[PDB]
Amino acid sequence: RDKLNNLVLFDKATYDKLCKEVPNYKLITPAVVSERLKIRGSLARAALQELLSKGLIKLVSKHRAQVIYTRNTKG
Template sequence: NYEKQNEKKNPENHIVGFFMNLFANYVRDTLNNLVLFGKATYDKLLKEVPNYKLITPTIVSERLKVRGCLARVAIQELLSKGMIKLVSKHRAQVIYTRGTEEGEGAEKEEKEGKEEIR
């Protein structure tokens, strides 16, 4: 009997019980993301995604309602077409940005100018 009274008074047990009750009714929303591209979704990918300032698989997955693996494949396709540019590649996250033609033209002019000086 004495041990049960001490268990109730132990603050660690109180904290654990508090967090168990806090998350007891927490239910995560289930996602119903697409596994394959439909015609409308693919057109939306080609039209909208290259205009995003920041492009990651997570952002593409959330905005187009597709699975993460499909988002990664779609980004690789856009990269191969030259519609987006790689900013940073890490084992956990890959970051791309829009491929602006105006910015690329300015960079080419700068490179040509440097070659003429040499």
């Protein structure tokens, strides 16, 4: 554990890894998807807002210091 030092404007591999891995697990925050894939964290916020614009995820809290998303329910 020396430095993180990696990522912004992700490639196609990280893009479709996001699109198939992110929208189906429970806690979706910019921090957990930043540390999850490799994402910087402002890019994570932008990507999560774009996913919410498509409608693959659900907005829960939306505070200026913490934004919380979740997967769509299954029935």
